[PDB]
């Protein structure tokens, strides 16, 4: 239903590990999009065949402004290619790098658009992890936009998932707190230079605020960063927490 002969590829958008991401244009409409290459070399040794071809079917029928649209996919002999929305202002990762820290307005706005994008996913009975700043792209209007749903680096994982317990959708409200902290402070709250330390930090939820973090964020962050899932606010509440409303954008 789609082949590489339909696209002229262009500039590399990003690269590394299992394949590459190229900007490209669909010939018969001149549509600008993004192609993800996989090589399938990692399909073996990860056995992640059907993997995504399953996640592909899931995401491909999701639709929302703060979620990066996936269009289709196709089999090369060697490579596997994904066809995604192209996001003109790149990752939040790069911008966090460029700016070091975010102000409360940009932080609380991103947090809003994220909170909305998740409740929609919950409503389609979709839960997950990631939401690492490398997986948040920016639309032409600066709107946040969630990349994919798929050891690892640990620091966005919640205590219940790393203790090996069971996890529901409340995983995503951990994540929200983690990012809102990273967005305000420049680094994630349980960062370490060791997988083993970070692991400790996360399971004991040990974080401290630098002084410049205001009380309204300390509050929101705190409420999201609790070892006990059932004690994390509901998305509905997050969207309406004063500091959000006070600082968020229209
Ligand atoms: C698989 C994947 C695809 C992208 C992606 C989608 N649209 C983009 N527009 C600009 N840049 C990027 N990336 C890709 C990776 O490095 C540069 C940022 C876009 C994003 C993340 C991802 O996992």
- Say how far apart CA 229 and CA 234 lie, in whole Å: 10
Residue nearest to atom 6 of ligand 1 (CA): 86
Round the CA-based radius of gyration of the chain to a whole number and report it. Answer: 19
> What sign does the CA torsion over 228, 234, 235, 239 have?
negative
The answer to whether residues 83 and 70 touch, using CB atoms and an 8 Å cutoff, is yes
The answer to whether residues 220 and 238 touch, using CB atoms and an 8 Å cutoff, is yes
Q: Is 155 a catalytic residue?
A: no
User: How many C-beta atoms surround the C-beta of residue 133 within 10 A?
Assistant: 18
DSSP state of 249: -
Q: How far is CA 58 from the centre of its chain?
A: 16
* The token pair that represents 250 in the structure block: 């229209």
Q: Which residues contact 236 (CB under 8 A, 6 or more apart)?
A: 119
Domains of the chain: 4-84 (3.30.200.20), 92-247 (1.10.510.10)
- Active-site annotation holder among 6, 76, 103, 130: 130
Helices (H) and strands (E) in the chain, counts: 9, 7
Buried b (16+ CB within 10 A) or exposed e, 60-75: eebebebbbbbeebee
The answer to whether residues 99 and 107 touch, using CB atoms and an 8 Å cutoff, is no
Angle between helices 104-123 and 171-185 (to 10 degrees): 160
- Say how far apart CA 9 and CA 6 lie, in whole Å: 10
Within 6 Å (CB) of ligand 1, which residues are found? 13-14, 21, 34, 36, 68, 84-87, 90-91, 135, 137, 147-148
SS3 string of 2-43?
CCHHHEEEEEEEEECCCCEEEEEEECCCCEEEEEEECCCCCC
């Amino acid at each position: 239903q789609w082949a590489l002969e339909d696209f002229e590829i262009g500039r590399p958008l990003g690269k590394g590990k299992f394949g590459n991401v190229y900007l490209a244009r669909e010939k018969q409409s001149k549509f600008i999009l993004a192609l993800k290459v996989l090589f399938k070399a990692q399909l073996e040794k990860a056995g992640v065949e059907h993997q995504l071809r399953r996640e592909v079917e899931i995401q491909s029928h999701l639709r929302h402004p703060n979620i990066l649209r996936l269009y289709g996919y196709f089999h090369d002999a060697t490579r596997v290619y994904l066809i995604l929305e192209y996001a003109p202002l790149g990752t939040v990762y790069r911008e966090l790098q460029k700016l070091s820290k975010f102000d409360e307005q940009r932080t609380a706005t991103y947090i809003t658009e994220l909170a909305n994008a998740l409740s929609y996913c919950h409503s389609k009975r979709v839960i997950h992890r990631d939401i690492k700043p490398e997986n948040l792209l920016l639309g032409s209007a600066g709107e946040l936009k969630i990349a994919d749903f798929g050891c690892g680096t640990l620091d966005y994982l919640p205590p219940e998932m790393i203790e090996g317990r069971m996890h529901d959708e409340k995983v995503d409200l951990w994540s929200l707190g983690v990012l809102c902290y990273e967005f305000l402070v420049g680094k994630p709250p349980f960062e370490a230079n060791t997988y083993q330390e970070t692991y400790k930090r996360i399971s004991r939820v040990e974080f401290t605020f630098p002084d410049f973090v205001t009380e309204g964020a300390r509050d929101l962050i705190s409420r999201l960063l609790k070892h006990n899932p059932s004690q994390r606010p509901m998305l509905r509440e997050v969207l309406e927490h004063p500091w959000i409303t006070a600082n968020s954008s229209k």
